[PDB]
Design a protein around this nucleic acid. Structure first.
Lengths: 254, 351, 256, 254
DNA sequence: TTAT
DNA sequence: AATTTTTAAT
DNA sequence: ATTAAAAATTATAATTATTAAAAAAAAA
DNA sequence: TTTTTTTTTAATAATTT
């Protein structure tokens, strides 16, 4: 009897608005420690690591380790029915494959019980032994969300270059040449919209920009995104969700 | 068919014509004359320049066209029954003599078309050579048995037996391209029942009881109007067309007083003037009993279309299997009732 | 001859955005006591009963019982030209072949005359009786716009059930099952966010959500919608316009 | 060899959103005294004259009569890669056929160096003469945005009738007949709401609406638009572009 | 052996 | 099935 | 001359996949 | 009311074979 009452219902809703266009179907590795999702996209390029710990949920309990298969497009349209101020309870059943979502606004009386039909794909999870990286670019997410939106009009590839002064999202293309030389600000005021770049070694990697448009759909979760990368390892697009775990995205470079 | 009955109805009684929608019926069963559907899906849907076929030789364009049309009809709640034409009567053989020479005129024209080889004229001329045999329907009635939709083999005529099906009340409408179903006496005739969602061809409904109210006739004299309008059984009088036959029937009522109240110099009576035989054929044809057969709606199967059409007709696997799933999601739901079952029409209001 | 001056002209604007997606062509039964529209849908399911009374209009005068066959898609294109603050005057003189819409702007002085070519319609009116409904639910109007938009993602059929202390908007489909419960909140002092359920017998029906999504475009008119049900009686989605009248949406249920 | 630093970026941004639908390919005749453009649309009906003077730019350093060929769809994509308060610095080079665009954020440190691949085209000197105008109708620009959009639902033919008491925009079609009549409001204290008509000869002639709808995409550039026309003269739909020159739109009547 |  | 010009009658 | 009717000439399409606009929903 | 964004539509050949 999995039951996760979440009082801030926009946290789960904005996750599913980000995975509805990139993950077709995945296994929610739901344990007693927290909600986990190690997935990979339908074009088999990118990797998604979503972690929701049990401290962010209000009442969390798991009788066993539940790994059910949920269609991410169908769960996102059902979470489109929830309000932005709703309270979301996930009353999954061990005996029958049905994930019951209960929405209830605290100011209102609207008890919105939503049950799902579940296709258990039983996909084996992909785990990555994460290590230290070269440049840990803690950068504002809603300002990063337009940066991949700007350079996608020019070309389908970007070159992200960590330097001494700051990062440089240089993107070429047949329409022209585009360089966004974002210097590091690191002001002590307004930490939710500041840039923090850690410096270890000079970095020059060429990426694919079609999936970075998909990666910026999780930007209403966190104000700050981490772009942590190294020399020949995929970058971690880490969205630190407030008082929970994290939603990390991966992209193997060109 | 009839030379301009639809133009006469649209230019005389526009209140008997209702341009409806594809979703406007939604539970009212119709009776498709399947022969015009089979000719529409062998003439319109081509591979380009010729018929569309697999490598075994036979054609299957009518199977996919009538497949997606049938699935789109039951997506909008319309429950089809497909009535196929049987052995035609001997009065129709004068039109089949005209259809034999008009097919053979395009056979001589195909020799002139294949010399130039221009695809604007090759594909135009080979559309007239479309002929439906027994194997064009024996491989086509088998598909509708897989749906559970009833297919009816008429003993004489599918246009006639569709009109007997609306007359008994077993079906709501006869969805038939020709205007003959008004002549055998269907009170509702539907036209242009097409799977397209756009309004490039609106679906036009012929209420025969609104025609006979507006014209002031009944069934036995609207048949007599059809004889002067050039039916397929017997030819019409050489000087009388659409506009000269509405006023003539409304002046002289029966067909036996058309001839005796006419000057034969201006309007020559033809030698093949079998009005009394066609009047017996139009009122009482030798159709099957509509109470003998019941319109059963069985559950469609998905695995039997794999061994019949995905393998033999080598179609797309992701479209037939999607087609049964979009059929069964529009079949198990409840039938939405119309509003006229609850409220009744009190005031007829006009602009 | 017929002149219907409306100071709050956005009321007549918000009517025709709610009918342009349902009624293609309607007959406006212009009486001397008000403006009436009883035009059933071309899909033969849903009736729209519109009642703009004479006392709600500013300067309403009328002589004969008019009947203007109006393409309502063409009306909503013309009525989109006025803003939300313009004084809207309808005009139709003797031998009414056209309807003259005058969008008098109150402050910027944009006098927009709009002469509409009408159409010839013979639309049958349906006799609506006066009956007592079983479960009368007085919802917020914006809440009902949410609920029909929510359950249309699941399936095309809502299952409205009236419990003893609530109303349940159940639905099912390929995505799963969705139940929306609304307990009554008659203790709340404001009537904008209050659900009032008038109960004498419980009733459970099934309605199509494609027509209910067309019904929830009248939500900019009123802040409170009334739903009226009985056993095998159509749903009356009523939007009571303040000091003008009602926009009643009738809806035939699904019968098993 | 040419640097045109501009303080606010929405002046160049709202030009290109007005010009992306109407002009697909034109040449920017950049002079020493300002930025000029004498284009004409892809259907060869409406002639577009643009002038951005040198005194309105913050730093102007043009050295030669530069006439580069700019794809206006490719420029308006790069002008979509900027904020509404950005600092836009254009650059060009003598040997390279490249128009460079540097976008500077005013409160951030986002330097967005964009370069454009240019091409050679038919450099046409249209050369319209200046002449007198019988009916000069200055109106609010959002009012002219409404009236061209309001009458486009009916048909594609607008007659514009002049009077001293007001101006009449009338359109007709198969859907119906429209007649929008303004008034010469001289009692309005502000200038962004008053309609001012300077007329001596009354005039009424038919104009198309497919090109007037593209003319009303320049309505965020200024709050005032002036309509100047005569009996056989094309109508001047003239915008202001703050205090930096003018944007002349010509439309030949039907 | 068979559509308008 | 509809058009469509040409031939024919009121 | 208008009306009308028979010589002749052309027609039967529907799904997915894009696609380029075109208004709608969320938030300006 | 109006910006920008996503969702339907009317688009149009493009196979469907």
């Amino acid at each position: 009897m999995f039951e996760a009452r979440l009082v801030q219902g926009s946290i789960l809703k904005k996750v599913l608005e980000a995975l509805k266009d990139l993950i077709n179907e995945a296994c929610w590795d739901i344990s007693s420690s927290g909600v986990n999702l190690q997935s990979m996209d339908s074009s088999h390029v990118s990797l998604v690591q979503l972690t929701l710990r049990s401290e962010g949920f209000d009442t969390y309990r798991c009788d066993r380790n539940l790994a059910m298969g949920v269609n991410l497009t169908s769960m996102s349209k059902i979470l489109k029915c929830a309000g932005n101020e709703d309270i979301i309870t996930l009353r999954a059943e061990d005996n029958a494959d049905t994930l019951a979502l209960v929405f209830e606004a605290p100011n209102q009386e609207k008890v919105s019980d939503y049950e799902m039909k579940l296709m258990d794909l039983d996909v084996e999870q992909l785990g990555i032994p994460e290590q230290e990286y070269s440049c840990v670019v803690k950068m504002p997410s809603g300002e990063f969300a337009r940066i991949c939106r700007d350079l996608s009009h020019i070309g389908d590839a970007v070159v992200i270059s960590c330097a001494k002064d700051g990062v440089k999202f240089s993107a070429s293309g047949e329409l022209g040449n585009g360089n966004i030389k974002l210097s590091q600000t690191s002001n002590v005021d307004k930490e939710e919209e500041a840039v923090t770049i850690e410096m270890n070694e000079p970095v020059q990697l060429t990426f694919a920009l079609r999936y970075l448009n998909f990666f910026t759909k999780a930007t209403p979760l966190s104000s700050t995104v981490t772009l942590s990368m190294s020399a020949d390892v995929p970058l971690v697009v880490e969205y630190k969700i407030a008082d929970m775990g994290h939603l990390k995205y991966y992209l193997a470079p060109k | 068919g009839i030379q301009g009955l639809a133009k006469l109805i649209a230019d005389v009684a526009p209140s008997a014509i209702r341009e409806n929608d594809i979703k406007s019926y939604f539970g009212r069963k119709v009776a498709i004359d399947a022969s015009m559907s089979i000719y529409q899906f062998l003439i319109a849907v081509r591979q380009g320049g010729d018929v569309l076929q697999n490598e075994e030789g036979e054609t299957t364009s009518h199977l996919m066209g009538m497949f997606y049309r049938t699935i789109r009809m039951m997506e909008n709640g319309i429950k089809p029954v497909y009535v196929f034409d049987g052995k035609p009567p001997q009065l129709k053989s004068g039109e089949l003599a005209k259809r034999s020479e008009r097919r053979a005129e395009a056979e001589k024209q195909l020799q002139q078309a294949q010399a130039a080889g221009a695809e604007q004229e090759v594909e135009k001329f080979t559309k007239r050579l479309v002929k439906v045999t027994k194997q064009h329907n024996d491989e086509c009635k088998h598909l509708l048995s897989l749906m559970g939709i009833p297919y009816l083999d008429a003993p004489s005529e599918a246009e006639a037996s569709c009109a007997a099906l609306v007359k008994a009340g077993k079906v709501y409408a006869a969805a038939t391209e020709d205007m003959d179903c008004l002549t055998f006496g269907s009170p509702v005739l539907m036209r242009h029942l097409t799977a397209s969602e756009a309004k490039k061809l609106p679906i036009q409904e012929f209420h025969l009881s609104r025609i006979l109210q507006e014209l002031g006739l009944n069934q036995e004299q609207f048949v007599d109007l059809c004889i002067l309008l050039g039916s397929d059984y017997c030819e019409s009088i050489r000087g009388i067309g659409p506009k000269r036959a509405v006023d003539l029937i409304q002046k002289h009522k029966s067909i036996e007083e058309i001839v005796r109240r006419l000057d034969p110099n201006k309007y020559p009576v033809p030698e093949n003037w079998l009005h009394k035989e066609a009047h017996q054929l139009f009122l009482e044809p030798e159709v099957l009993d509509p109470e003998s057969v019941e319109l059963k709606w069985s559950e469609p199967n998905e695995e039997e279309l794999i061994k019949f059409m995905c393998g033999e007709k080598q179609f797309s696997e992701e479209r037939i299997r999607s087609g049964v799933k979009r059929l069964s999601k529009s079949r198990q739901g409840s039938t939405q009732g119309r509003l006229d079952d609850f409220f009744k029409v009190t005031g007829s209001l006009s602009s």
